[PDB]
Design a protein around this nucleic acid. Sequence first.
RNA 1: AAGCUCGUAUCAGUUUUAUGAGGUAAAGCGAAUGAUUAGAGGUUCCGGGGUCGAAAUGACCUUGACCUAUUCUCAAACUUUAAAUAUGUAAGAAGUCCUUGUUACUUAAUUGAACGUGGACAUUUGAAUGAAGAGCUUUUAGUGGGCCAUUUUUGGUAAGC
RNA 2: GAGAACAGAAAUCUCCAGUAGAACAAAAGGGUAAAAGCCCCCUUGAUUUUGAUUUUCAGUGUGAAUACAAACCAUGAAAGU
RNA 3: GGUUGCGGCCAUAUCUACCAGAAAGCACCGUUUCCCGUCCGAUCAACUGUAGUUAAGCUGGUAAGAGCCUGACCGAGUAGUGUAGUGGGUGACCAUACGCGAAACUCAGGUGCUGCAAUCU
RNA 4: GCGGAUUUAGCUCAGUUGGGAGAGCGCCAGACUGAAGAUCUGGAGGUCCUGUGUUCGAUCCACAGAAUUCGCACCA
RNA 5: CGCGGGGUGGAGCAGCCCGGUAGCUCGUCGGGCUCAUAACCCGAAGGUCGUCGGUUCAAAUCCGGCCCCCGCAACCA
RNA 6: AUGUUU
Lengths: 169, 58, 296, 159, 215
Amino acid sequence: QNPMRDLKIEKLVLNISVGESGDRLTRASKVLEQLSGQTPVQSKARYTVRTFGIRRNEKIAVHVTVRGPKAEEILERGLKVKEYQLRDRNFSATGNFGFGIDEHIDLGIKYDPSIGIFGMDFYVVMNRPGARVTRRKRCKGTVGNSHKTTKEDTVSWFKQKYDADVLDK
Amino acid sequence: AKSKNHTAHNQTRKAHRNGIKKPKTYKYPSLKGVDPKFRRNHKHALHGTAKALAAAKK
Amino acid sequence: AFQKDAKSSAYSSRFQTPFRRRREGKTDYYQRKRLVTQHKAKYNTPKYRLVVRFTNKDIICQIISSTITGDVVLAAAYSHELPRYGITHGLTNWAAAYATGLLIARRTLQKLGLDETYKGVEEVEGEYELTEAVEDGPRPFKVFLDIGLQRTTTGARVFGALKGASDGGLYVPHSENRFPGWDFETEEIDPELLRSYIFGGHVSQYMEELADDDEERFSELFKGYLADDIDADSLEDIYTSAHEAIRADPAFKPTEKKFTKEQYAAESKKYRQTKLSKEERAARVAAKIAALAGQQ
Amino acid sequence: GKSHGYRSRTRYMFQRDFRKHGAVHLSTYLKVYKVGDIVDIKANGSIQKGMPHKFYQGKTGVVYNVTKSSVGVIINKMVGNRYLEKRLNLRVEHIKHSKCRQEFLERVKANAAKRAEAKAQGVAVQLKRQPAQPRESRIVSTEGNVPQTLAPVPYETFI
Amino acid sequence: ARRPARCYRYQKNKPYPKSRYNRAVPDSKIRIYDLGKKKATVDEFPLCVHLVSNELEQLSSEALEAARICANKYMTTVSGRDAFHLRVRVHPFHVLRINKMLSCAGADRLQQGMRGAWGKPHGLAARVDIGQIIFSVRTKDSNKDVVVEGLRRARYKFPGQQKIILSKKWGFTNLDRPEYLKKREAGEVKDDGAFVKFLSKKGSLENNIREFPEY
RNA sequence: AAGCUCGUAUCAGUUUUAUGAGGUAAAGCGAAUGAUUAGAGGUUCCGGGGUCGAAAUGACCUUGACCUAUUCUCAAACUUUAAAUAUGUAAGAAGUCCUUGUUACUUAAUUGAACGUGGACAUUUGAAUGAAGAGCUUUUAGUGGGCCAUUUUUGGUAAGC
RNA sequence: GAGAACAGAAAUCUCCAGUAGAACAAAAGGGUAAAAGCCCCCUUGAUUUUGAUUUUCAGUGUGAAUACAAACCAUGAAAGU
RNA sequence: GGUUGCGGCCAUAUCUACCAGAAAGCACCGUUUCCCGUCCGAUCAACUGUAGUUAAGCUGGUAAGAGCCUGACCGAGUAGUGUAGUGGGUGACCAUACGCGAAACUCAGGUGCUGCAAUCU
RNA sequence: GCGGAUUUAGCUCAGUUGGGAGAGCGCCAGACUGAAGAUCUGGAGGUCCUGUGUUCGAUCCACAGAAUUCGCACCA
RNA sequence: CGCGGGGUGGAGCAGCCCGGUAGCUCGUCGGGCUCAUAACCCGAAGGUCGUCGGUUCAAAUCCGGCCCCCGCAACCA
RNA sequence: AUGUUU
Ligand SMILES: [K+]
Ligand SMILES: [Mg+2]
Ligand SMILES: [Mg+2]
Ligand SMILES: [Mg+2]
Ligand SMILES: [Mg+2]
Ligand SMILES: [Mg+2]
Ligand SMILES: [Mg+2]
Ligand SMILES: [Mg+2]
Ligand SMILES: [Mg+2]
Ligand SMILES: [Mg+2]
Ligand SMILES: [Mg+2]
Ligand SMILES: [Mg+2]
Ligand SMILES: [Mg+2]
Ligand SMILES: [Mg+2]
Ligand SMILES: [Mg+2]
Ligand SMILES: [Mg+2]
Ligand SMILES: [Mg+2]
Ligand SMILES: [Mg+2]
């Protein structure tokens, strides 16, 4: 008895933060471009802190936002790398969740030493219908408490769908 | 040798000996800072009003 | 609540609330100041805004002026009035916006006695041209477009309503670089594409493309079109007839108002919770206190 | 060294009336000012253009000119032992219509009405205001109001 | 060398606290303001005795520390370390300045006189008003004479006139003893620390039920 | 000093009424900023150590910090509030109301703006008090070291500083 | 604050709270939240003419600033600026 | 009386936690050929009003609710302060006389009002 | 008291552009030598003069204080 | 302001006075020789010519700017 | 060409 309080993937963001801006960054860009099917966006470093050779605005990371069935499919493909089991600590209090994989080549196209091997970061932002209320230009509102996504609801939805399970507290 | 630097002592008494004078209000004050577009048209309006009032003596 | 909800007393005490219509996210006061503020050397001249709002299923087209007591509507036109002029589907599309602009323009000019003079663009070809002043005669009724918070894009329905009100004979200052058909690569607009949009050519082209593609989608969308037997090629003459009917009689017949305001109020007053009195609040507090004969 | 800038010593004068910061409400711009209207000057610190000098904060003058976004105000500034005419060009956010003469206009209208009704009904005018007069005699009753006797209280510390 | 207190007895200057514009202020001599059984509950110490200023003046931090030590030592040695709670209720926030005029005659040669005479931070002082409490001490009614004598001893360390006033309030609360007793018998007083919290007839009933089970 | 134009008359180191402006005195700190005393609840993700824990923080012990509700005391260069005194303006005939002429300005528009024509209103012509009158001009002297008293107040221990 | 491989206190990605506790060249004060802040697009009104005005003030100058007029422009859909 | 569009004053309107909402409106909601804009039709653009829902937004109600607002012989004629004395006091300061007169506090009440146009069981 | 200055592994110092603390002379270890000195190779070496503060960080961008010095301290 | 001159590996440097093409010595790294160092021998590393712009089948060199240094001379707001 | 000491 819940008309449209139906948890659904709002988006899935794939992220690869290379510590450098060299050819490795372009390689990671093409990696997370090929599976996403979209042009990704490089993320400039904001400081020059230490241990990374990063500097202000060096374009050290690359990420891509996927929605719809493509996001659902990339999620279901990245979940088998985790064997459809995730840590409870992976679930944010706002009802989102994520996981990290390594050796992206274990899906789709093989090693292809021209592109090399990369690890990737999967973050799934979960919402219900009516999330447009918070994002639209006009009459911007705040989703009500009963309608907010929670970790206690996202964990339950994540074991309902994908027939998965979670780990210790 | 140092000296006094400033004081307003006796200044109000000096000013009130001949008194603070209100600035003699006039009818028809000057149009100095008035908008020049308004003034340009006001000249024509006044010339026309003068001509009309002259002709109105028949 | 949490350590981040239920903000503290000092925060609540020092919070300055925005204007109510800024809290509601409805009025850009930065734009409203520049739309509404009049040259002080005119001393009474109302600045009229052609306010164009797009809700779901309805278009709001008003001509509004401002006063200290509040905005005053001069003439209003809605997209739910296009059925009277022979438009019953797509009541929020580009062509409906153009029709509503034409309707507000004709209605306002009639209200001001400027319908005969300033006929506007009666033979519309989709060309960029403003309502020109006639020689030895009153100037056209000037209104300034008010999008509100809707974005300025090339091809927006708000600029379709702008174009409709301009063609209707209202002087609405505007450029053409936001109309559909404007060639962003160059300095010119495609008048044939603008005319197509004015007459719903994009909607009818979609109708025929969807007919020659998956027919389930053409049965779901345009279901009312098939159930009213409206061919895609009939949209142009539908909009032509609508423009002619609008120019014929933009006189704003209002609805017949069944169940008059007294019974409207009486019916709505049943599903309305009333505020409790201070004695009722005291009784409720006393009841919650005395319910602890011991402690629950 | 010393410092006398244009906005020197205006730190509190040009502040925004705590919890009334931000955008100027539209009535300020919807006000209408004609040549001869009496206005009070109160600078809005959020509108830095057309701003009066700090001397004119709280001064009342007469509009002599009307421009696109501003009015010319005539102030009588005291300099030395006389008054000099000053012409300020103030944006309408820094001026409000003065109520220093609304009571006078209402008295003018009431006086015209009273004069008319008087020369219609009989012979009496009494059109000049009067200062608060000494109270008239009165009888004060004790029914339910028998006087209570108070005495000065002894000293105590209550600390 | 420290200048005698008579040079800074009176509130001749505006308050001059340590701030963004001083940055060079020496440490106050009195650093402890709560001593004795500062953890005792409000019920434990009903009697309050105040050492109250009768003059508008400035008390130095050195005088405050000396008087605190004197009073605490007397009350501790006569009645016990835990028989009282003494609180110093003035804080030396006003900075005193000194224009250091050179000794070692010939100073006039290497001296500009009163030129640039603005002084450097020299010490701290509390600015007390007439009727302002300087010391408060709560204790049991049986310890009245010991507490009053400790405050009378501390009085000798202060310039100006101070009065010993027995407070009609319960301990360090703002309620007169009959009213505190009435509220405690009514159950609208709960121990929080050495102080208490009072049940109000405002706020959420849920909170006023959780706290104060007087119902 | 010389006067000059007038004198039904003008104004005022004052009050009253009406209407503003101010951020000092006071006040406030369980209100923002900054200071500042103490105890009490939590946070073991408290900084964690010790101690066990085979080990984890897992238990404690504990100091630390944060968070919550309180508590003592403060600010020339803090502040929600906020005086007293002082201060701007108005209290009419150069006013108010009614009609309608000019314009190249302004309006969609005789719309408005400004200036007018014509018409109506003198006992209190629209508070109080006073007014060896009011207004105006020219031209020149000396002076341009100041000091003192109450009150406000800065530097200074202070000073007949 | 809560989350994501390397990745920890600091890298990048995500959500939530967030009256400004940030930023606006510099001193300080004021001002600013669909902005005056950040990012992006287009530009040269940092132009021409000669007046008026405010502060300092002798109601001189200089500096700075305000509101117009008469042009030519920029920008925006536009009001406007 | 509800609702929308535009509003005026800009918390009595805000904040937190719950509950309710008939009609209509608003809204979420469906689609990606076209105009347009995105890493992403999420936003923005367009199309449909059709497939669905009042879950959320929104509106209203509830709370010895936080905040805010109003008022008060509540505190308090207190603090402060204009004027006065060959008043007091070594002084610090203080009292008195003729006037003006707070803030905190306490308590009580309240929790948007309203303009134009349209629309609705 | 005024005007300058410089404070960094034990000693002398380089510093540091909003990084990251380094080079010699010492010291230790290991080589070579019958062995010592000499010489070679390495390695550790500081909580950057102090506290607090701007800061993503920042001895280094920056605030005041100290330590060691220099110079001046006159007309009577 | 004028007239001249100069800036090249870490350093001094020749190279330029009409492109055929960046070198000399020391210092630094390795080996040889020696019983071991020095000299010496054989190697190896170190610049693209202070910075811009221009002419030229292809410019350290020509041509003009900018910066820095030096020498002489010049001086009405 | 230089190569100290026991
Ligand atoms: K004493
Ligand atoms: Mg002297
Ligand atoms: Mg002099
Ligand atoms: Mg806008
Ligand atoms: Mg103010
Ligand atoms: Mg002083
Ligand atoms: Mg001497
Ligand atoms: Mg001040
Ligand atoms: Mg004070
Ligand atoms: Mg002289
Ligand atoms: Mg903007
Ligand atoms: Mg200057
Ligand atoms: Mg969508
Ligand atoms: Mg849209
Ligand atoms: Mg619901
Ligand atoms: Mg409440
Ligand atoms: Mg006297
Ligand atoms: Mg021997």
